[PDB]
mmCIF file of C-alpha atoms and ligand atoms in Angstrom:
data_model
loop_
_atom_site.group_PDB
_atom_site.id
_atom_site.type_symbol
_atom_site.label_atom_id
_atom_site.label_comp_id
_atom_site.label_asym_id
_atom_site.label_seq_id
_atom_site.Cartn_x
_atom_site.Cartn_y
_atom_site.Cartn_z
ATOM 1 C CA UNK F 45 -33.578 -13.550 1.799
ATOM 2 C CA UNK F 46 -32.538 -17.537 2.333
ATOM 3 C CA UNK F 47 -34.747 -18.601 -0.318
ATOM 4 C CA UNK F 48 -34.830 -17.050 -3.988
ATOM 5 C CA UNK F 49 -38.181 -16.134 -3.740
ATOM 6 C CA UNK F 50 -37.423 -14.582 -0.357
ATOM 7 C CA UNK F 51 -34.620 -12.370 -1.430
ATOM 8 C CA UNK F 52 -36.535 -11.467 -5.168
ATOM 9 C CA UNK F 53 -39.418 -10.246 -2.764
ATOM 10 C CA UNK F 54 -36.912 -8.131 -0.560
ATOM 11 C CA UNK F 55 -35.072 -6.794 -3.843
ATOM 12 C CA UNK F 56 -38.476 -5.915 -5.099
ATOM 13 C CA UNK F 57 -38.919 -2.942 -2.474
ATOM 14 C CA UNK F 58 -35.038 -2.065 -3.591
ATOM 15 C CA UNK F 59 -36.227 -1.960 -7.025
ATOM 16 C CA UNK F 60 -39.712 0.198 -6.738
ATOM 17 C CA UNK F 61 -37.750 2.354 -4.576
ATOM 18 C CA UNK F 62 -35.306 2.940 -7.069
ATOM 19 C CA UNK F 63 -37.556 3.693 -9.828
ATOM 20 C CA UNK F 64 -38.821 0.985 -11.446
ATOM 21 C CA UNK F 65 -42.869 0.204 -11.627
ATOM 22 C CA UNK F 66 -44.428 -2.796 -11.103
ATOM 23 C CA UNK F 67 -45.206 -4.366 -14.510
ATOM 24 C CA UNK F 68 -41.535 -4.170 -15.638
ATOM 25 C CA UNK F 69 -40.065 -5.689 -12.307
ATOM 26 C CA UNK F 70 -42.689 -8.688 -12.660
ATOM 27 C CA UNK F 71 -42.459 -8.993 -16.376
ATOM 28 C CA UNK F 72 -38.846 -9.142 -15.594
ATOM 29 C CA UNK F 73 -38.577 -12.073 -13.369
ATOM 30 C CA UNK F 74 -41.421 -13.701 -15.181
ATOM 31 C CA UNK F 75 -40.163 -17.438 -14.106
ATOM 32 C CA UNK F 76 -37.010 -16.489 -13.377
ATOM 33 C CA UNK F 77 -34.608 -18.917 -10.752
ATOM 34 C CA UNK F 78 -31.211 -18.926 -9.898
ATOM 35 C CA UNK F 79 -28.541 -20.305 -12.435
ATOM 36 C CA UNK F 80 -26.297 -22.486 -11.263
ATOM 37 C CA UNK F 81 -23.775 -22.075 -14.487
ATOM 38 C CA UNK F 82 -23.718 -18.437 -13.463
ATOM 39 C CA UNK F 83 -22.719 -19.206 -9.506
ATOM 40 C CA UNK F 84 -19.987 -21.634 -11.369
ATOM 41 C CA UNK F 85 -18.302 -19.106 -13.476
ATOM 42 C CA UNK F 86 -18.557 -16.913 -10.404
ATOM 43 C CA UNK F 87 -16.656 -19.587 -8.430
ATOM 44 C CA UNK F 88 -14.093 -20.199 -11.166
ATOM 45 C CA UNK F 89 -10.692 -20.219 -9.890
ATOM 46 C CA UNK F 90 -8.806 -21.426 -13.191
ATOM 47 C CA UNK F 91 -5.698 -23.527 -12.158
ATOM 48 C CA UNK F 92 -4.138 -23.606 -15.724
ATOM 49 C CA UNK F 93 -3.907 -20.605 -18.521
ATOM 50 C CA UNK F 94 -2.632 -20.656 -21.856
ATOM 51 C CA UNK F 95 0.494 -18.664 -23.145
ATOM 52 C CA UNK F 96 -0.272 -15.199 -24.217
ATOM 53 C CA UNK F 97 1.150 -16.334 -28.132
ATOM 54 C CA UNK F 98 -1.635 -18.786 -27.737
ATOM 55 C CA UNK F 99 -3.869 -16.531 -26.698
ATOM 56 C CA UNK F 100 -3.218 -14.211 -29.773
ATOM 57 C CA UNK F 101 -3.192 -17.058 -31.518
ATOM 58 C CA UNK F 102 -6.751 -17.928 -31.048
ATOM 59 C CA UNK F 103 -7.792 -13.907 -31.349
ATOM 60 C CA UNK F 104 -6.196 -13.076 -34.528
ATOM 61 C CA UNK F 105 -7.367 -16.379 -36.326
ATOM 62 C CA UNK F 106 -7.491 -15.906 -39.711
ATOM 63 C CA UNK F 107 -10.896 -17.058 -39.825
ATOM 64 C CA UNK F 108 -11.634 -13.786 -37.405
ATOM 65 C CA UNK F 109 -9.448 -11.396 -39.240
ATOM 66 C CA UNK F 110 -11.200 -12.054 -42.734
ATOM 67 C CA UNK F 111 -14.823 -11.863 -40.431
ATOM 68 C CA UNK F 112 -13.985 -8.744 -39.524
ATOM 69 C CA UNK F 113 -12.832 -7.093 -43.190
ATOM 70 C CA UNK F 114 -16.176 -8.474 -44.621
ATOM 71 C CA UNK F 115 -17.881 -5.953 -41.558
ATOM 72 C CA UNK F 116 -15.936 -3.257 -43.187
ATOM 73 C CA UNK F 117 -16.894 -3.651 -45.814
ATOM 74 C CA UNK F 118 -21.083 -4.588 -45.050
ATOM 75 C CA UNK F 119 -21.140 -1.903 -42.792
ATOM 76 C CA UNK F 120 -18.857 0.967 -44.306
ATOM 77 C CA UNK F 121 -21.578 3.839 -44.377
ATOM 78 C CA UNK F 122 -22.122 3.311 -40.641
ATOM 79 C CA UNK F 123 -18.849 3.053 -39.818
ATOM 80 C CA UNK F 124 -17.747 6.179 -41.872
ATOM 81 C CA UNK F 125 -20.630 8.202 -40.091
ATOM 82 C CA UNK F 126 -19.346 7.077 -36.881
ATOM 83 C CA UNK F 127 -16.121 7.024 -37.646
ATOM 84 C CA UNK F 128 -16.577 10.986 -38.741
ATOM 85 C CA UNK F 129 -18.768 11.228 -35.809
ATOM 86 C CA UNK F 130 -17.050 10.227 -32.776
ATOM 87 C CA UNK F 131 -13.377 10.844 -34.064
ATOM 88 C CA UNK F 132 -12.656 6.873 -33.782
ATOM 89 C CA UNK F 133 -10.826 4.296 -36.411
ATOM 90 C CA UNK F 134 -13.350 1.932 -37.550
ATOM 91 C CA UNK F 135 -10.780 -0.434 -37.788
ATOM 92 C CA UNK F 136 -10.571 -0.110 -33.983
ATOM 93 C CA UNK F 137 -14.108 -0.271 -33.626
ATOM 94 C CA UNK F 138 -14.618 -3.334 -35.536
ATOM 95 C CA UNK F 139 -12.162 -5.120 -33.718
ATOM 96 C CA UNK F 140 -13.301 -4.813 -30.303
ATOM 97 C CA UNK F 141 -16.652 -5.955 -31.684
ATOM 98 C CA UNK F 142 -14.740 -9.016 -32.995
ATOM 99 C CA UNK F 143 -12.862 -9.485 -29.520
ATOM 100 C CA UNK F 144 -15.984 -8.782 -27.465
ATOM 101 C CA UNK F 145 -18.989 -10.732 -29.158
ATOM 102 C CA UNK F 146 -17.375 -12.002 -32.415
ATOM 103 C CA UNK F 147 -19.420 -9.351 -34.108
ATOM 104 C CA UNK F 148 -22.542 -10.139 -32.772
ATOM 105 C CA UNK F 149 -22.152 -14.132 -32.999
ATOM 106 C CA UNK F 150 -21.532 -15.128 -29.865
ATOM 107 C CA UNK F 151 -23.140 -12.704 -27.356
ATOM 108 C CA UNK F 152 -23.862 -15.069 -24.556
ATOM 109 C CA UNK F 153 -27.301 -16.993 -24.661
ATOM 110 C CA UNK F 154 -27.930 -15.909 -20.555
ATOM 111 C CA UNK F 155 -30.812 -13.650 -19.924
ATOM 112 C CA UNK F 156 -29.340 -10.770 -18.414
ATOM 113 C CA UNK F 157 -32.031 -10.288 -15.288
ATOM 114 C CA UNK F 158 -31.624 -13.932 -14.196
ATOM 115 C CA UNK F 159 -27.651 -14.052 -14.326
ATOM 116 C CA UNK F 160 -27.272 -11.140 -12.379
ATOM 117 C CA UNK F 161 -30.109 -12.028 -9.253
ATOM 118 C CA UNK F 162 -28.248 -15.190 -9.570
ATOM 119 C CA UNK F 163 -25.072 -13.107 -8.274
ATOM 120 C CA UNK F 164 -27.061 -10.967 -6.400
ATOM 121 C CA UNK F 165 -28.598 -13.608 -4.328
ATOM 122 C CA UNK F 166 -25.505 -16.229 -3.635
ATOM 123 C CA UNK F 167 -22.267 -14.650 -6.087
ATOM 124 C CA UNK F 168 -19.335 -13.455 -4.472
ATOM 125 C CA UNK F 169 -20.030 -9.978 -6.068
ATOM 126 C CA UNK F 170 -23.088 -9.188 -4.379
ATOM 127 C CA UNK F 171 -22.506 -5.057 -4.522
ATOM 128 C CA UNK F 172 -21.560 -5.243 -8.114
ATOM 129 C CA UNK F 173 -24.449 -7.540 -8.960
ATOM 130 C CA UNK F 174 -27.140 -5.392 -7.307
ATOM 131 C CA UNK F 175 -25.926 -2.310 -8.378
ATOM 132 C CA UNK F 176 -25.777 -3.979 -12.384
ATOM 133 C CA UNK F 177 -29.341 -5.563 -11.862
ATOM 134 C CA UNK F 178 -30.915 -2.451 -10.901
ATOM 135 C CA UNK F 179 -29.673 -0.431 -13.865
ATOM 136 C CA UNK F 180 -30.567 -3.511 -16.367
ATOM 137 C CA UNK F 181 -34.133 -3.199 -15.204
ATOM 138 C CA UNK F 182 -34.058 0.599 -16.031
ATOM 139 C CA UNK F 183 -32.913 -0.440 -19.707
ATOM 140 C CA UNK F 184 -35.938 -2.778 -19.981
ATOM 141 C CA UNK F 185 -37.913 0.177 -18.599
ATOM 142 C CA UNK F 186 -36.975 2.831 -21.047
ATOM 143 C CA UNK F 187 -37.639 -0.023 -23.598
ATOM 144 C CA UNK F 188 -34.104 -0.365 -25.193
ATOM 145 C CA UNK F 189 -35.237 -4.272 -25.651
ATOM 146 C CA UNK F 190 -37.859 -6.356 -24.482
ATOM 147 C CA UNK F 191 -36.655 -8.436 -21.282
ATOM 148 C CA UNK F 192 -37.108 -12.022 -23.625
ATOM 149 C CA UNK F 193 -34.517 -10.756 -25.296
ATOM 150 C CA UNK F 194 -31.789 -9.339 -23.018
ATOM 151 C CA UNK F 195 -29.247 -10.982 -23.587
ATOM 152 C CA UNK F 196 -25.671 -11.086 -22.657
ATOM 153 C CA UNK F 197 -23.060 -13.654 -20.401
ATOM 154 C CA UNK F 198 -22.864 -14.892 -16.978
ATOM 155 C CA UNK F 199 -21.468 -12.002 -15.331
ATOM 156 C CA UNK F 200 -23.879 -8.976 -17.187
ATOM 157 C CA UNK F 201 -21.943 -8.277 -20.356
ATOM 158 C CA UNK F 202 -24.988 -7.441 -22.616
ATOM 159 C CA UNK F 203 -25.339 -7.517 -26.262
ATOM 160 C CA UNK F 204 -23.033 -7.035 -29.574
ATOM 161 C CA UNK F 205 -20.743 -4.632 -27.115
ATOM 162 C CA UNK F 206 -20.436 -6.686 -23.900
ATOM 163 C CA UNK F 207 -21.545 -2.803 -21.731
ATOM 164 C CA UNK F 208 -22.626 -4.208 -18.141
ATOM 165 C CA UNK F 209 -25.623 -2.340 -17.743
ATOM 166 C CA UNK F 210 -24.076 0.680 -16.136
ATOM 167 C CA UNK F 211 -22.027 1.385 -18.826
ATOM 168 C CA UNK F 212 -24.859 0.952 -21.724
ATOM 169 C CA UNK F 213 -26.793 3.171 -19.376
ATOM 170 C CA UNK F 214 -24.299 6.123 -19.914
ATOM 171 C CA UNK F 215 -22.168 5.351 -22.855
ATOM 172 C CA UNK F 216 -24.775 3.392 -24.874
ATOM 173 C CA UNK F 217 -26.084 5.240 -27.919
ATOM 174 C CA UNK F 218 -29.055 5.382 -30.229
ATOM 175 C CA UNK F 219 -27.480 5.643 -33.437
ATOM 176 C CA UNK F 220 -30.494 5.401 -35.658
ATOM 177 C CA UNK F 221 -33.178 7.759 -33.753
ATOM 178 C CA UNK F 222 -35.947 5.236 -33.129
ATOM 179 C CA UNK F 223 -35.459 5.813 -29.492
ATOM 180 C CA UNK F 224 -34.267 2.476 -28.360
ATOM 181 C CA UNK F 225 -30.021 1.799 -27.325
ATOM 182 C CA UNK F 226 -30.299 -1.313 -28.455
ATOM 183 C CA UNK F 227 -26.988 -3.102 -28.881
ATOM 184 C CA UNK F 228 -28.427 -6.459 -29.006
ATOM 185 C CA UNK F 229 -30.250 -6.538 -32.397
ATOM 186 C CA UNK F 230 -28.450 -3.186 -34.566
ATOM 187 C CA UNK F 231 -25.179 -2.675 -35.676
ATOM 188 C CA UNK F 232 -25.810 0.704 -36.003
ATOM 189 C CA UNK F 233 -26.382 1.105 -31.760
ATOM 190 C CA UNK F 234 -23.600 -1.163 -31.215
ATOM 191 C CA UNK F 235 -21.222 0.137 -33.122
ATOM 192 C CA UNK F 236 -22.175 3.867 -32.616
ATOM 193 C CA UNK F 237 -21.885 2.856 -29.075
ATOM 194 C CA UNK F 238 -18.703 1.281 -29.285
ATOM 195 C CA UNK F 239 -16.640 4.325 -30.287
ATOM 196 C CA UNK F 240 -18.720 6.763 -28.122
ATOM 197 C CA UNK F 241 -17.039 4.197 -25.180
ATOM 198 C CA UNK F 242 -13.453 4.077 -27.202
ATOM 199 C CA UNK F 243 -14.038 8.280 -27.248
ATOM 200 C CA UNK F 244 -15.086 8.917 -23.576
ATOM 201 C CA UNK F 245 -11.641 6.674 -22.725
ATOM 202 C CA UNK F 246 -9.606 9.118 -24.948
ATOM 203 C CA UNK F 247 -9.226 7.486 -27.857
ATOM 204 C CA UNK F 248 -7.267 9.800 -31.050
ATOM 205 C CA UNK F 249 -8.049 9.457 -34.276
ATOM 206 C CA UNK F 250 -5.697 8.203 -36.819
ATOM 207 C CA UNK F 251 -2.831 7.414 -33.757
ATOM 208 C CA UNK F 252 -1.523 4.495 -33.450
ATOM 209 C CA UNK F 253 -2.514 2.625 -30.880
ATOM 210 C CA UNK F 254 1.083 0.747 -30.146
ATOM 211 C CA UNK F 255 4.385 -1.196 -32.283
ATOM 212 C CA UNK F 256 6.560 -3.489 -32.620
ATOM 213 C CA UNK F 257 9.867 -2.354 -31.132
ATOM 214 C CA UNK F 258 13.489 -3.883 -31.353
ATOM 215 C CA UNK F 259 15.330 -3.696 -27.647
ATOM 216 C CA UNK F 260 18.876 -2.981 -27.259
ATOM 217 C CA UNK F 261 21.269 -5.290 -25.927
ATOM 218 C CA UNK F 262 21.276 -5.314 -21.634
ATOM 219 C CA UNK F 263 18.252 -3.292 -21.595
ATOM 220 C CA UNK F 264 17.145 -2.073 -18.032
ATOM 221 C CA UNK F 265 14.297 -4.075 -18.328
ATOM 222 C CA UNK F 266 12.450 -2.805 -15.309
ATOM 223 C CA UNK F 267 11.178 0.190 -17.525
ATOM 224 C CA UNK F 268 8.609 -2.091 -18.807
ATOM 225 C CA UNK F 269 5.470 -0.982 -16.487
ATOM 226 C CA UNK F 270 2.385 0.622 -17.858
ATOM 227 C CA UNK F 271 2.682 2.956 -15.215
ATOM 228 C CA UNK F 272 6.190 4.009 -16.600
ATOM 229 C CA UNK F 273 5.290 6.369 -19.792
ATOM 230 C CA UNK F 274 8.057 7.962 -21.802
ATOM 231 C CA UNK F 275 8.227 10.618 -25.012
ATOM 232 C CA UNK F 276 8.691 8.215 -28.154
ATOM 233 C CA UNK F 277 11.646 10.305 -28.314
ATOM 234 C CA UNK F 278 12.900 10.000 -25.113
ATOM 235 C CA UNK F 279 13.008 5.646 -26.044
ATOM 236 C CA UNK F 280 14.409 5.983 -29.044
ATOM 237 C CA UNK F 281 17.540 7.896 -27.629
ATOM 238 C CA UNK F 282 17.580 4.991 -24.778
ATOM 239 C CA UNK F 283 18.712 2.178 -27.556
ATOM 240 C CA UNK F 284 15.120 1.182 -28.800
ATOM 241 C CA UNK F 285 14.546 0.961 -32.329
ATOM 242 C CA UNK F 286 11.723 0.049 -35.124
ATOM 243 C CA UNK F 287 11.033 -3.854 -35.254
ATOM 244 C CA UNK F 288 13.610 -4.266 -38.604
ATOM 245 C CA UNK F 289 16.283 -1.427 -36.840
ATOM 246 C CA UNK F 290 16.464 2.027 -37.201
ATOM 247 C CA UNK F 291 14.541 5.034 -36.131
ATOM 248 C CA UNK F 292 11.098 4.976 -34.450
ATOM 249 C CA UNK F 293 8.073 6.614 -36.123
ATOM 250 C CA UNK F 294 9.269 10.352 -36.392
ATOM 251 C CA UNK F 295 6.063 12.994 -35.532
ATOM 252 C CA UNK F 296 5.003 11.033 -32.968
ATOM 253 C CA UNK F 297 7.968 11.872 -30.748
ATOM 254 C CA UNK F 298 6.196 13.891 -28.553
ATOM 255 C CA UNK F 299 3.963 11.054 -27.688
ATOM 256 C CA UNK F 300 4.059 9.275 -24.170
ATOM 257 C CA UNK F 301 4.696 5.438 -24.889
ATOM 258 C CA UNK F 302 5.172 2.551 -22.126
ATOM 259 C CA UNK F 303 7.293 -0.924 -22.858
ATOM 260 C CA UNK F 304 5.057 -4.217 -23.134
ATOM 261 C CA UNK F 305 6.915 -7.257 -22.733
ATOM 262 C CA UNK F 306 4.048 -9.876 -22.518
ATOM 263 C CA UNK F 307 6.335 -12.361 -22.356
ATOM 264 C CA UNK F 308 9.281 -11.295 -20.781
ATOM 265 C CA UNK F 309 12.880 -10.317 -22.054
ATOM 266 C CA UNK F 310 12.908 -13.085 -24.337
ATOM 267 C CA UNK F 311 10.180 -12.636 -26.241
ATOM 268 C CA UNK F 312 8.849 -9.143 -28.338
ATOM 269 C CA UNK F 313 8.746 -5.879 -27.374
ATOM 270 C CA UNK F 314 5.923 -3.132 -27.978
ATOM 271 C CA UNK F 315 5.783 0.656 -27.256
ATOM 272 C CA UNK F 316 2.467 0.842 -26.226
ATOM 273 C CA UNK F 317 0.519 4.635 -26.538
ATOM 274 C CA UNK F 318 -2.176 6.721 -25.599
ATOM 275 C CA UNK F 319 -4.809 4.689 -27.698
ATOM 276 C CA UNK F 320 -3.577 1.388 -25.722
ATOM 277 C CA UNK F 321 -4.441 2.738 -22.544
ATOM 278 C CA UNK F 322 -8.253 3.671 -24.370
ATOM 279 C CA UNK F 323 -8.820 -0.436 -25.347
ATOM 280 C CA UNK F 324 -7.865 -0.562 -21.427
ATOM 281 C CA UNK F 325 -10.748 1.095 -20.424
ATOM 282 C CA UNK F 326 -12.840 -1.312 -22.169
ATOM 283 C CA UNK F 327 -10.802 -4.497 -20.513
ATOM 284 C CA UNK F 328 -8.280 -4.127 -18.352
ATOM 285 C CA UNK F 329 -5.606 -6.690 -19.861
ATOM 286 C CA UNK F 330 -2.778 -6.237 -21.942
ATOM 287 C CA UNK F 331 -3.054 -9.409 -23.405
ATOM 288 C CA UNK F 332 -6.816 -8.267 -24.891
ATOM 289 C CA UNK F 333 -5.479 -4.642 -25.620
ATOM 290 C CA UNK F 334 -2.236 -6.024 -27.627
ATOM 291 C CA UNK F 335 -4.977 -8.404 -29.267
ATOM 292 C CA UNK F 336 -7.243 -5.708 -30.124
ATOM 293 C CA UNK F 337 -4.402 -3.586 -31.422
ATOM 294 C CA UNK F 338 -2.936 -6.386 -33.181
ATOM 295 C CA UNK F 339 -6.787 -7.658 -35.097
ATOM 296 C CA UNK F 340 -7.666 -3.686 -36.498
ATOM 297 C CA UNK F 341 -3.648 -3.829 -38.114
ATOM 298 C CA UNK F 342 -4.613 -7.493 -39.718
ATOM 299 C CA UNK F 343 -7.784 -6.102 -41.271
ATOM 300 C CA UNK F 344 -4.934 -3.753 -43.277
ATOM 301 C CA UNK F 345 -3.083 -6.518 -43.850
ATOM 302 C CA UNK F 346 -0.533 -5.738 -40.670
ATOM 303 C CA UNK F 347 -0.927 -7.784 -37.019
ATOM 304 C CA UNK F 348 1.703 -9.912 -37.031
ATOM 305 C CA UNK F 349 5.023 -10.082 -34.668
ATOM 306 C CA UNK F 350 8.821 -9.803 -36.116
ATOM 307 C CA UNK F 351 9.845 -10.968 -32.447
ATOM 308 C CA UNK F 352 9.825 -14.489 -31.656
ATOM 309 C CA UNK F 353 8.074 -15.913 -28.786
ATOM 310 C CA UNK F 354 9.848 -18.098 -26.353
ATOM 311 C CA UNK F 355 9.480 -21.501 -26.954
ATOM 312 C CA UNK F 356 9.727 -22.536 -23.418
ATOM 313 C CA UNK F 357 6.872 -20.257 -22.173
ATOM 314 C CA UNK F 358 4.498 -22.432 -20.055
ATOM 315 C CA UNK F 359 2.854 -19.971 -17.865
ATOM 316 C CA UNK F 360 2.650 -20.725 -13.760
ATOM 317 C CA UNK F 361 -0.880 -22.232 -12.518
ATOM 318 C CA UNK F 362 -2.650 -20.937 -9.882
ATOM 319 C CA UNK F 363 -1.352 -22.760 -7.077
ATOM 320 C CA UNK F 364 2.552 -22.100 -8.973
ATOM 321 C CA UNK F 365 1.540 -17.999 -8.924
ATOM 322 C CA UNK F 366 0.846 -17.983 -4.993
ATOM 323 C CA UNK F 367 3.878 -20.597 -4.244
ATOM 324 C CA UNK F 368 5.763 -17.897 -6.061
ATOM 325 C CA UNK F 369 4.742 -14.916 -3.699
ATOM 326 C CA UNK F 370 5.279 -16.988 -0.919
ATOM 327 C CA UNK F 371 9.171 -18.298 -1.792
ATOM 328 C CA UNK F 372 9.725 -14.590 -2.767
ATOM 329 C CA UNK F 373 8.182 -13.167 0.328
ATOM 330 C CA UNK F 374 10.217 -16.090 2.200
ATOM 331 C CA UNK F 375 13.582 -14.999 0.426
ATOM 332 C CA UNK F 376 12.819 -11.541 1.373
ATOM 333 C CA UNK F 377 11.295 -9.683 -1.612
ATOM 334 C CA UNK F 378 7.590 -8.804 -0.144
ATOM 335 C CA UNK F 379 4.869 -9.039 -3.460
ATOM 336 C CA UNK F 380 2.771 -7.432 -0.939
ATOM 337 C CA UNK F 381 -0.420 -9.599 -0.597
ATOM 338 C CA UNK F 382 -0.300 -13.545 -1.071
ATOM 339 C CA UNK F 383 -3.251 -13.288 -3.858
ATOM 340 C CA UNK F 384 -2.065 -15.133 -6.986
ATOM 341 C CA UNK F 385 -2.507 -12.263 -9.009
ATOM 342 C CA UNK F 386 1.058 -10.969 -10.219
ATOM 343 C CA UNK F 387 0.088 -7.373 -10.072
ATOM 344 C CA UNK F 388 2.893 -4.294 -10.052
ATOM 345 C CA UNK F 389 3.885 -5.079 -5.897
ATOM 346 C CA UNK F 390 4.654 -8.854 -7.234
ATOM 347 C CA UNK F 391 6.863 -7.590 -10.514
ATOM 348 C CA UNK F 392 8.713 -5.494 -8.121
ATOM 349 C CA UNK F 393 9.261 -8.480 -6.035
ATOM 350 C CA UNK F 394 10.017 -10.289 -8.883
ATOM 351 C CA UNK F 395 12.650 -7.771 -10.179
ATOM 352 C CA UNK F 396 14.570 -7.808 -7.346
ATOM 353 C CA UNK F 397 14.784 -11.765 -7.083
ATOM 354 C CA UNK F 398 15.526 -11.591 -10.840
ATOM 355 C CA UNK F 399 18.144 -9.457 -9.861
ATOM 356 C CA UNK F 400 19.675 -11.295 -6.759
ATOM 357 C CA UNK F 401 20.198 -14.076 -9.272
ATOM 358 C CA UNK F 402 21.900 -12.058 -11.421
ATOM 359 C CA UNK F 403 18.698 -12.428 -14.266
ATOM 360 C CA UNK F 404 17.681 -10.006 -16.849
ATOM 361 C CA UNK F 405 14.858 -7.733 -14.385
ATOM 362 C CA UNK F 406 11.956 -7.889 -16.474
ATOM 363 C CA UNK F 407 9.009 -9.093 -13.609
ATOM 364 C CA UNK F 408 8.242 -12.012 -15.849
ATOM 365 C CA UNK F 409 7.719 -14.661 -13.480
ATOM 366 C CA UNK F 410 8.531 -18.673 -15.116
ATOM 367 C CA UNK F 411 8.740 -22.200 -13.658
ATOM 368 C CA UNK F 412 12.341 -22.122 -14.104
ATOM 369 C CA UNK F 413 12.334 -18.763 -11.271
ATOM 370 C CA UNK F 414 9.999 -20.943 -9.216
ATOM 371 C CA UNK F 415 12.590 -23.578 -9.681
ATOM 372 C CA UNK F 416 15.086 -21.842 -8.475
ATOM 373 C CA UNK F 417 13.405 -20.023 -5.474
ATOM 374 C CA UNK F 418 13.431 -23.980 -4.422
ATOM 375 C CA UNK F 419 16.290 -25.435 -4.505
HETATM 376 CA CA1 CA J 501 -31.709 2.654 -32.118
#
């Protein structure tokens, strides 16, 4: 519909054909209107981002990393049941809680119904936001929480896990048996829930999820691609060592590893594993992966990087990412699609310029390789 009312009334038939009765659909948009801070975060194009050092910088805060040992420690006989129960690290565990809702703290303070028929009725992710808002309104049918209280940020992240309301609907969990999911108001749900997730996305217990690696000198740099796995074995006979030199952590040679270079060939170098590629599933950046990775070592008292990070490491804006596809695309080295989003077609693109300039290949686009592509 053109007005709100107009398209709740037409979404209403969607809804009652779909399943859901009356009283909950009402109850539901009880004085409900659009949000106009949820059509803004929808419309968010961010010209500047920080550094990824920053980034970690901000995630494993010491302030955070002490948060989340005093969970451990609050919540150990939970943890240790799920833990047992699902075959996941609590440290793991507690530190995508930490990375996803600050354990609970900061969960959003959006009601979850009103944020997503706000994208539903005039976001740019109408299919998505349809598709969330009917499965939300089965949640408040089944009773998981009352709708007052369903809470979660702008774009349907709900509760102490962040789930959008497809994924509490089949990877949520009632932990205690009092027939409610609710990941809004108990640890034990959310953190139950949690590791069922980290377990349906292949998590192993007890592996680690990635390390610290030391890179030989004139390293073929355009291994580094998530989509490029490797035997630990296989690396370590390829010049790559442990962070202080030496051999890489024998046992584990069998295991399939990928390089991360989050900040190019200058900066420090991971072998990233099976477990990485789990904390993927749950968001789908390396940045938030290494961070998660990085917060369950600090709760051991590990978490921090041998490698230093380049001091020179001002990432390109928006506008700077597309001028890049376009001067590479111009020079002849096709990114594929003129998006702004430095995906694997714009790395290769990137390698190859890298490469024509004679550059170390390792797809990490900088100002000074915009520079360059203008002179
Ligand atoms: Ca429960």
């Amino acid at each position: 519909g053109q007005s709100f009312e107009q398209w709740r009334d037409a979404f209403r038939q969607q809804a009652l054909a779909g399943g859901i009765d009356a009283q909950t659909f009402d109850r539901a948009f009880a004085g409900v209107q659009p949000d106009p801070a949820v059509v803004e975060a929808d419309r968010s194009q961010p010209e500047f981002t920080r550094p990824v050092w920053k980034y970690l910088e901000g995630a494993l805060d010491p302030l955070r990393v002490r948060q989340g040992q005093a969970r451990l420690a609050q919540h150990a006989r939970i943890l240790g049941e799920v833990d047992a129960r699902y075959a996941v690290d609590a440290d793991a565990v507690v530190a995508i809680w930490g990375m996803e809702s600050n354990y609970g703290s900061h969960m959003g303070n959006k009601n979850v119904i009103r944020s997503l028929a706000t994208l539903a009725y005039e976001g740019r992710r109408p299919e998505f936001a349809h598709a969330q808002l009917l499965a939300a309104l089965k949640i408040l049918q089944h009773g998981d929480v009352p709708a007052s209280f369903m809470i979660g940020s702008w774009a349907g992240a709900m509760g102490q896990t962040q789930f959008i309301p497809t994924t509490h609907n089949q990877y949520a969990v009632d932990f205690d048996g009092d027939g409610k999911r609710d990941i809004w108001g108990s640890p034990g749900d959310a953190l139950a829930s949690t590791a069922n997730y980290l377990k349906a996305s292949g998590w192993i217990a007890g592996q680690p999820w990635g390390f610290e690696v030391r890179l030989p000198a004139g390293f073929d740099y355009s291994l580094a691609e998530l989509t490029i796995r490797k035997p630990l074995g296989e690396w370590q006979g390829m010049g790559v060592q442990g962070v202080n030199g030496g051999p890489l952590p024998s046992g584990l040679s069998g295991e399939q590893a990928s390089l991360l270079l989050p900040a190019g060939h200058r900066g420090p170098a991971f072998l990233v594993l099976h477990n990485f590629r789990a904390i993927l599933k749950y968001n789908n950046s390396s940045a938030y992966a290494l961070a998660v990775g990085l917060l369950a070592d600090s709760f051991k008292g590990g978490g921090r990087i041998v490698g230093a990070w380049p001091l020179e490491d001002v990432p390109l804006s928006r506008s700077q990412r597309i001028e890049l596809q376009r001067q590479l695309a111009a020079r002849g080295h096709d990114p594929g699609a003129v998006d702004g989003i430095i995906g694997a077609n714009t790395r290769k693109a990137i390698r190859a310029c890298q490469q024509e300039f004679g550059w170390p290949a390792d797809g990490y686009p900088t100002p000074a390789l915009l520079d360059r592509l203008r002179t």
